[PDB]
Amino acid sequence: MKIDILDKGFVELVDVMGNDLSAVRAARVSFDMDEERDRHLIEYLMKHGHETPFEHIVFTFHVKAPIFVARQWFRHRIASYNELSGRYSKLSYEFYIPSPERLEGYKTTIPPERVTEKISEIVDKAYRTYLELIESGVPREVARIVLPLNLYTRFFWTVNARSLMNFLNLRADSHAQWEIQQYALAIARIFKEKCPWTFEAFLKYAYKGDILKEV
Amino acid sequence: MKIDILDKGFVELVDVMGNDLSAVRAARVSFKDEERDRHLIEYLMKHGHETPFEHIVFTFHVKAPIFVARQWFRHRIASYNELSGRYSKLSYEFYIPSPERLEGYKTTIPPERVTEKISEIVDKAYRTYLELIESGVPREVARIVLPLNLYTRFFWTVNARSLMNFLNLRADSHAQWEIQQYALAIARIFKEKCPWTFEAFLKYAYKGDILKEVQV
Amino acid sequence: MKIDILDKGFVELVDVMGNDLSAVRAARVSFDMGLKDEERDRHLIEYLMKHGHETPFEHIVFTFHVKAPIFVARQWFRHRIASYNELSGRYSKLSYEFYIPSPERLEGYKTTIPPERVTEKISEIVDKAYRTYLELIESGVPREVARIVLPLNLYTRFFWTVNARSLMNFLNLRADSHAQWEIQQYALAIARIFKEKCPWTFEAFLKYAYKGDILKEVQV
Amino acid sequence: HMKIDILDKGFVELVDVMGNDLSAVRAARVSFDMGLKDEERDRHLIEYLMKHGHETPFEHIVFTFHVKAPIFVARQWFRHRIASYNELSGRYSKLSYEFYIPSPERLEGYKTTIPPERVTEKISEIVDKAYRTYLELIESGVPREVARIVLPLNLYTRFFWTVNARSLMNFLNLRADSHAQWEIQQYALAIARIFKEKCPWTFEAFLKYAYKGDIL
Ligand SMILES: Cc1cc2nc3c(=O)[nH]c(=O)nc-3n(C[C@H](O)[C@H](O)[C@H](O)COP(=O)(O)OP(=O)(O)OC[C@H]3O[C@@H](n4cnc5c(N)ncnc54)[C@H](O)[C@@H]3O)c2cc1C
Ligand SMILES: Cc1cc2nc3c(=O)[nH]c(=O)nc-3n(C[C@H](O)[C@H](O)[C@H](O)COP(=O)(O)OP(=O)(O)OC[C@H]3O[C@@H](n4cnc5c(N)ncnc54)[C@H](O)[C@@H]3O)c2cc1C
Ligand SMILES: Cc1cc2nc3c(=O)[nH]c(=O)nc-3n(C[C@H](O)[C@H](O)[C@H](O)COP(=O)(O)OP(=O)(O)OC[C@H]3O[C@@H](n4cnc5c(N)ncnc54)[C@H](O)[C@@H]3O)c2cc1C
Ligand SMILES: Cc1cc2nc3c(=O)[nH]c(=O)nc-3n(C[C@H](O)[C@H](O)[C@H](O)COP(=O)(O)OP(=O)(O)OC[C@H]3O[C@@H](n4cnc5c(N)ncnc54)[C@H](O)[C@@H]3O)c2cc1C
Ligand SMILES: O=c1[nH]c(=O)n([C@H]2C[C@H](O)[C@@H](COP(=O)(O)O)O2)cc1F
Ligand SMILES: O=c1[nH]c(=O)n([C@H]2C[C@H](O)[C@@H](COP(=O)(O)O)O2)cc1F
Ligand SMILES: O=c1[nH]c(=O)n([C@H]2C[C@H](O)[C@@H](COP(=O)(O)O)O2)cc1F
Ligand SMILES: O=c1[nH]c(=O)n([C@H]2C[C@H](O)[C@@H](COP(=O)(O)O)O2)cc1F
């Protein structure tokens, strides 16, 4: 399961442990204890704020996104990450170039297409400088500091359903930067596919964002 | 995989995400070569690069005495869900030390006596507990008379990194003998599911003193 | 500040880092700003609270000294985003101190025997249990084993260091009617101390983020 | 309060502190139902805790730092999850013209084609070009959050960092080390200096029995 994001990014499901019943199983071991009663249990937990059971469902995603997006994403501390190193490996000539539509709703002094060019220009100059420095003998960890924030990076993300729902509340929301919103929509999609009951209950009683209830 | 512990407890594997290769894929950030992948696991462990192992996750079902659970629950980097003494009626299941548990201490009374002394207050406490309930006393208040050796059950979801920290601390002679027994069981299961990580752990990071002397 | 809880327990403030302004300074770095005036700053706290910007409050930290029954501590210790250090039954000779519910504790439930009867039967188990505990020790039984006969109402002690964000989550969950009465009582004391040290944050918390019920009916 | 300048335009500034060495002693002492004692026994306890890996007591010592560092350094720093952060926003505020320009010495031990002076020149140039484009887009009507994506990783950012002594020591083990990038090493050294100043005993014990790095 893979979903393309932005111009060169993506979100792909690597692994998953459990499903909706994993939360039911965990929670049930509380009352010292059926598709109908179990699904209702999930609604009950979601409705009353008992989310610890959902921590027993875990996902591992492989993500490709611009650094400025990853910086916001990595602020979510209740999760595990492993990302490509700009000091250990040579960075690929891959940058996020906003589409003209990105600026829609904004009256700019110059046509959107021009903005696209300006950004692509800097990217090109920075990357060339980067390559020159390396070939010149400068260590990679130093050379890459001239590279712009829209440079793509990749990382593995392991997170449980509870932290994932917090992520969606904050990132699958109009207040979050559009770019990460797009990734969050992808995460939600995959989450829905693997845990329909939990996702359904989440949207109905806990989800605090706005966009998931309109897309 | 279900292993009996003490007189009435157990450790059961409920689920697991990944295997040794999960740590390898995460470290490389990719997606093949047994020799190279195994080498990487050792490399990561030897140099303290522990984060890749967080991508391996386990869910256990555990039955243990509350005094053991209290120590176990001090490990904050994990998820727990346990039976409630205020929501359900507690079963008559208590941990009675084996006659050999005190074999090594200068005791004045015979092992059978200790067993009888413990079994005695246990029976009295539970009887009192049931009495209060039947009398209308809320469960949450009635259970306060129950001894710390009462058995409880919980689900534990933890990643390999935090699990290794648990083994360093609990699979060790300094920890209470009772939790050591559980830690040995967790270690066996870990070893079965992640042989490479487990071996590299014992070889380069394990800080305890029993897993190196004991088998699996 | 040392508030008595239940019959022998307590909550005491050991230390604190920062105050309402600590959260303001933290939040301001976002817009490349610092403090302003007490009017604008207090407005920010309220603003942060109502919009779900919780991280700034993580910069306010408290350390409490708590004495409570083990069954209460077990619930308390489930809050993982905090630090704890507790008295050890493996390393220390536990003293004779147990939580004996007051007669009023059962007020509201139609029981068979008198509230005073429940009291005596609880104290009975306690005495017999502690009795056996000392005997086992006197007999050479190591403390870590001897204590397993002790009941859950035995009092324990611990230090608790937690930041304002986690503390608010604690209050949402424990200063609430769904939590056991015993820990509710402790949560009220935590709230009282919180209110005194961070009045702006506290007030903003009750009006905008607090999800519990009792703090809106009870004072401080 | 303390402030140490790092790199060409950065700094590490102590904002607040909760507790001191004795805070760890008090927290630890509760285990034996005890409290503070003399200076000789208390300091000895700290070394004891450190030696045997009993680290929880140190979690009761907390610091709040105010840091100004380039983004590439901050990204590594923010990987330390057991802490609290609040940082300057590129989508909410106009970013200032401050970039980390390596000094000629930075390339020490590295023989490069073009003179180090030239490396400095080239870095400043791309930096200048990117920033001007940034302002151009901003005055052009482009949202701050979009315009800033052309800015390089050596752009200076600012943030508040609240961390307890236990996590701080893990930070030093990893960042106050030759394996970590030189730039963050410099920040780590300033962090250690402040730590030492505020918690002499803890720091001394840490360096003698727990510190895993190689530059302190
Ligand atoms: C619209 C928007 C604007 C933002 N603007 C800024 C900004 O200007 N500056 C900035 O620095 N950040 C900003 N952020 C990032 C924000 O401050 C959080 O870091 C981010 O949302 C990650 O959330 P989290 O802390 O809830 O999650 P996680 O770090 O993944 O934590 C999940 C849960 O565990 C918790 N938790 C984890 N660790 C701790 C701890 N140490 N103490 C107490 N509770 C803890 C909380 O209950 C939390 O919700 C913004 C986010 C959004 C969505
Ligand atoms: C032999 C033995 C004796 C003990 N005696 C006592 C006693 O007398 N009193 C007592 O209260 N406890 C005692 N403990 C419990 C001990 O203090 C820890 O709570 C327990 O080992 C759990 O370990 P942990 O903190 O490493 O693990 P986890 O809580 O699972 O944490 C794992 C890792 O994340 C970290 N971490 C998590 N949270 C934080 C945080 N908030 N700040 C900084 N780092 C963090 C550290 O790197 C840690 O190793 C004892 C344990 C053992 C094994
Ligand atoms: C009325 C009531 C009834 C309860 N009944 C039961 C029961 O029957 N069985 C039982 O076992 N427990 C029960 N509990 C305990 C409950 O499951 C939680 O452990 C307790 O409320 C502590 O809350 P917390 O997880 O939100 O807080 P903390 O552990 O302090 O965590 C604070 C925040 O960080 C988060 N967080 C921390 N760690 C993780 C993680 N690993 N993954 C994802 N997010 C994380 C979340 O955003 C969280 O709210 C009950 C609690 C209450 C108040
Ligand atoms: C020389 C060097 C090279 C590096 N190279 C890379 C690289 O190529 N790619 C990359 O992505 N990162 C890299 N890193 C970052 C590294 O992977 C860690 O993210 C960083 O050191 C932060 O450390 P930490 O996890 O120990 O600390 P914190 O996140 O602050 O955690 C402190 C303690 O709590 C723990 N803990 C916290 N959360 C969890 C959890 N969810 N599960 C289990 N235990 C937990 C552990 O005991 C840990 O030591 C590198 C770091 C160094 C020093
Ligand atoms: O929407 C946001 N999301 C986020 O996670 N940050 C955190 C990410 C980074 O650590 C710092 C600066 O972010 P940015 O420049 O994207 O605003 O604050 C800020 C925002 F505005
Ligand atoms: O070996 C131990 N393991 C442990 O986790 N504690 C923590 C558990 C509990 O929160 C408190 C007291 O534990 P105990 O009475 O078992 O010593 O400290 C203490 C020990 F001695
Ligand atoms: O109100 C509660 N609060 C709580 O923290 N638990 C957690 C505490 C313990 O780990 C386990 C059983 O608790 P208890 O017997 O008190 O119900 O679940 C349970 C409740 F019902
Ligand atoms: O020394 C390092 N420290 C660090 O924290 N990372 C993490 C930071 C970032 O999230 C990603 C890429 O870092 P960098 O490009 O600096 O190598 O991995 C990587 C290193 F090599």
Listing DSSP states for D78-93 in one string gives TT--SSEEEE--TTTS
Method: X-ray
Cα–Cα distance measured from residue B141 to residue D77, given in angstroms and rounded to the nearest whole number: 47
Instruction: Give me the sign of the Cα torsion angle D36, D38, D43, D45.
Output: negative
Cα C67 to chain center, whole Å? Answer: 9
Q: What is the CATH number of domain D1-216?
A: 3.30.1360.170
Neighbours of B53 (CB within 10 A): 27
Q: Which distant-in-sequence residues (6+ apart) come within 8 Å of D185 by Cβ?
A: D175, D176, D177, D178, D215
Is the shortest distance between the CB of D56 and ligand 2 below 6 Å? yes
Q: Report whether D32 contacts C94 (CB < 8 A).
A: no
Q: Report which bound ligand comes closest to the CA of C29.
A: 1
- DSSP result, B38-85: HHHHHHHHHTT--GGGGG-EEEEEEEEEHHHHHHHTT--SSEEEE--T
Residue B38 contacts residue B199 (beta carbons within 8 Å): no
Contact D21, D202 (CB under 8 A): yes
By three-state DSSP, how is residue D18 classified? strand
**Burial letters for B137-156: b for 16+ Cβ neighbours within 10 Å, e otherwise?**
bbbebbbbbbbbbbbbbbbb
How does DSSP classify residue D94? P
Is D19 in the C-facing interface, judged by CB distances under 8 Å?
A: yes
- Cα Rg for chain B, rounded, in angstroms? 20
Q: State how far the Cα of B143 lies from the Cα of B137, in Å rounded to an integer.
A: 10
A175 touches chain D (CB under 8 A): no
Per residue in C83-99, is it b (16+ CB within 10 Å) or e — as a string?
bbbbbbbeebebeebbb
Give dist(CA B189, CA B191) in Å, integer: 5
Dump the DSSP string for A107-144. --SS-HHHHHHHHHHHHHHHHHHHHHHHHHT--HHHHG
Q: How far is CA C128 from CA B150, C99, C133, D123, in A?
A: 17, 15, 9, 79
Distance CA D45, CA A125 (A): 58
Q: Determine which helix (DSSP H) or strand (DSSP E) holds A19, and give its type and residue range.
A: none
For C1-220, CATH gives 3.30.1360.170
State how far the Cα of C98 lies from the Cα of B118, in Å rounded to an integer. 19
In this structure, are residues C85 and D30 in contact, taking their beta carbons and an 8 Å threshold? Answer: yes
d(CA C185, CA C56): 28
Give the number of the atom of ligand 7 that is nearest the alpha carbon of residue C77.
Answer: 5
Whole-number Å distance between alpha carbons of B112 and C158: 35
Distance CA B147, CA C153 (A): 9
Q: What are phi and psi of D152, to 5 degrees?
A: -70, 160
Question: Please, are residues D9 and D183 in contact by the beta-carbon 8 Å criterion?
Answer: no
E strand intervals along D88-197: 156-164
The DSSP output letter for C109 is: S
Chain centre to alpha carbon of residue C145? 28
In whole angstroms, what is the distance from residue A101 CA to residue A112 CA? 8
Contact assessment for residue A58 and residue A159, using Cβ atoms and an 8 Å cutoff: yes
Residue type, D214: D
Of D10, D14, D69, residue with least CA distance to D196: D14
Which of D126, D151, D184 to mutate against chain A (most A CBs within 10 Å)?
Answer: D126
State the Cα–Cα distance between residues D184 and D176, nearest whole angstrom.
8
Dist CA D145 CA D138 (whole Å): 10
Q: Which residues on chain D are in Cβ contact (under 8 Å) with A77?
A: 81-82
Sign of CA dihedral B4, B6, B9, B10: negative
Which of B101, B123, B121 has its CA nearest to residue B111? Answer: B101
Q: Is any ligand 5 atom within 6 A of the Cβ of residue A177?
A: yes
Return the structure tokens found at A78.
């209740």
Distance CA B119, CA B99 (A): 13
Is A119:A192 a contact under the CB 8 Å cutoff? no
CB of C75 closer than 6 angstroms to any ligand 7 atom: yes
Query: What does the alpha-carbon distance between residue B58 and residue B51 come to, in Å, rounded to a whole number?
Result: 16
Question: What is the number of other CB atoms lying within 10 angstroms of the CB of residue B44?
Answer: 22
Nearest CA-CA distance, residue C18 and chain D, Å: 7
**Would you say B39 and B216 are in contact if contact means Cβ atoms under 8 Å apart?**
no
Residue type, B2: K
Q: Which residues pair with D16 in a beta bridge?
A: D64
Distance set, CA B74 to CA B23, B67, B166, B169 (Å): 26, 12, 10, 11
Tell which of C102, C117, C125 to mutate to test the B interface (max B CBs under 10 Å).
Answer: C125
Residue nearest to atom 4 of ligand 7 (CA): C75
Cβ-defined contact of B29 to A156 (cutoff 8 Å): yes
CA distance C64 to D56: 15
Question: Which of B72, B75, B159 has most ligand 2 atoms within 8 Å of CB, for mutation?
Answer: B75
CATH class of A1-215: alpha beta
- Residue of chain D nearest C32, judged by CA positions: D88
Secondary structure letter of residue C78 according to DSSP: T
Radius of gyration over every alpha carbon of chain A, rounded to an integer in angstroms: 21
| H or E, element range at C5 | strand C2-5
Of C125, C107, C127, give the one whose Cα is nearest residue C116.
C107
CA angle C125, C128, C133 (to 5 degrees): 120
Beta-carbon neighbour count of residue B74 at 10 Å?
Answer: 13
Chain C residues in contact with D58 by the CB 8 A cut-off are none
The torsion region of residue B57 among left (phi > 0), alpha (psi -120 to 50) and beta comes to beta
Ligand found nearest the CA of D82: 4
Cβ atoms of C152 and C70 within 8 Å: the answer is: yes
Q: What's the Cα-to-Cα distance from B144 to each of B171, C86, C119, C188, D68, rounded to whole Å?
A: 31, 20, 12, 22, 53
Q: Which residue has the tokens 């990217």?
A: A123
Q: Binding site annotation covers D14? A: no
D3 Rama sector, left if φ>0, alpha if ψ -120 to 50, beta otherwise: beta
Q: Where do the H-state alpha helices sit in D52-115?
A: 71-77
Q: Which of C201, C206, C208, C202 is nearest to C217 (CA)?
A: C206
Q: D27 and C64 in contact (C-beta within 8 Å)?
A: no
In whole angstroms, give the CA distance from residue C106 to residue C206. Answer: 29
Query: What residues are paired with C180 via a beta bridge?
Result: none
Nearest CB neighbour to B148, from listed C124, C126, C148: C148
How far apart CA C41 and CA C34 sit, in angstroms, is 10
| Residue written as token pair 């005695």 | B120
Dist CA B27 CA B33 (whole Å): 15
Which has the closest alpha carbon to D65: D2, D148, D136, D144?
D2
Q: Using CB atoms within 10 Å of the CB of residue D83, give its burial: 0 to 12 exposed, 13 to 18 middle, 19+ buried.
A: buried
For every residue of B86-148, which 3-state class applies, written as one string? CCCCCCCCECCCCCCCCECECCCCCHHHHHHHHHHHHHHHHHHHHHHHHCCCCHHHHHHHCEC
Instruction: Tell whether C89 lies on the interface with D, counting CB pairs under 8 A.
Output: no
Helices first, then strands: H and E counts in chain C: 8, 5
Relative orientation angle of helices A112-136 and D116-140, to the nearest 10 degrees: 170
How far lies A32's CA from each of A27, B4, B83, C193, D130, in Å? 10, 19, 6, 37, 62
Burial C8-26 (b: 16+ CB within 10 A, else e): ebbbbbbbbbbbbbbbbbb
Q: Ligand 6: which residues within 6 Å by Cβ? A: B 67, 70-71, 74, 175-176; C 86, 88-91
Whole-angstrom distance between the N-terminal and C-terminal Cα of chain C? 14
Residue D113, CA atoms < 13 Å, CB-side half-sphere: 8
Q: How far, rounded to the nearest angstrom, does the alpha carbon of residue B172 sit from its chain's CA centroid?
A: 13
d(CA B43, CA D101): 34
DSSP C31: G
CA distance A178 to C150: 58
Q: Which tokens belong to C74?
A: 């077990």
Chain A nearest C-alpha distance from B107 (Å): 38
Sign, Cα dihedral of D194, D198, D200, D206: negative
Picking from A66, A53, A46, the residue whose alpha carbon sits closest to that of residue A155 is: A66
Q: Where are the beta strands (DSSP E) in chain D?
A: 2-6, 10-18, 62-70, 84-87, 156-164
Burial B163-180 (b: 16+ CB within 10 A, else e): bbbbbbbbbbeebbebbb
Q: Whole-angstrom Cα distance, residue B49 to residue B160?
A: 13
Taking the C-alpha atoms of residue A181 and residue B141, their distance in angstroms, rounded to an integer, is: 48
Please give the order of strands across the beta sheet that includes C155-163.
C2-5, C9-17, C61-69, C155-163, C83-86
Using alpha carbons only, how large is chain C's radius of gyration in Å? 21
| CB atoms closer than 10 angstroms to residue B29 | 20
CA C178 to chain centre: 15
Task: Show the tokens assigned to A170.
Answer: 């904050």
**Active site members of B:** 170
Q: For residues B189 and C129, what is the distance between their CA atoms, to the nearest angstrom?
A: 37
CA of C86 to the centre of ligand 6 (A): 7
State the CB neighbour count (10 A cutoff) for residue C140.
14
What stretch of H or E contains C155? Answer: strand C155-163
**Cα(D53) to centroid(ligand 2), Å:** 10
User: A7-45: buried (b, 16+ CB within 10 Å) or exposed (e) per residue?
Assistant: eebbbebbbbbbbbbbbbbbbbbbeeeeeeebbebbeeb
Check: CB of residue A106 under 8 Å from CB of residue D141. yes
Quick one: resolution in A?
A: 2.0
Q: From the list C17, C83, C157, which residue is nearest D56 (CB)? A: C83
How does DSSP assign A138-186, residue by residue? --HHHHGGGSBTTBEEEEEEEEEHHHHHHHHHHHSSTTS-HHHHHHHHH
| Distance linking the first and last C-alpha atoms of chain B | 14
Domain ranges of chain D: 1-216
Q: Which residues pair with A152 in a beta bridge?
A: A66
β-pairing, D10-18 with D62-70?
Answer: antiparallel
Closest CA to B213 of B170, B184, B174: B184
Which one of A22, A32, A62 has the shortest CB-CB distance to B15?
A22
3-state secondary structure A57-114: CEEEEEEEEEHHHHHHHCCCCCCEEEECCCCCCCCCCCECCCCHHHHCCCCCCCCHHH
**What residue ranges line ligand 8, CB within 6 angstroms?**
A 83, 85-88; D 72, 75-76, 79, 180-181
Token output for D7: 């790199």
Q: Of D15, D153, D165, D3, which Cα lies nearest the Cα of D82?
A: D165
Nearest CA in chain C to D88: C30
Nearest to A80 by CA among A19, A14, A140: A14
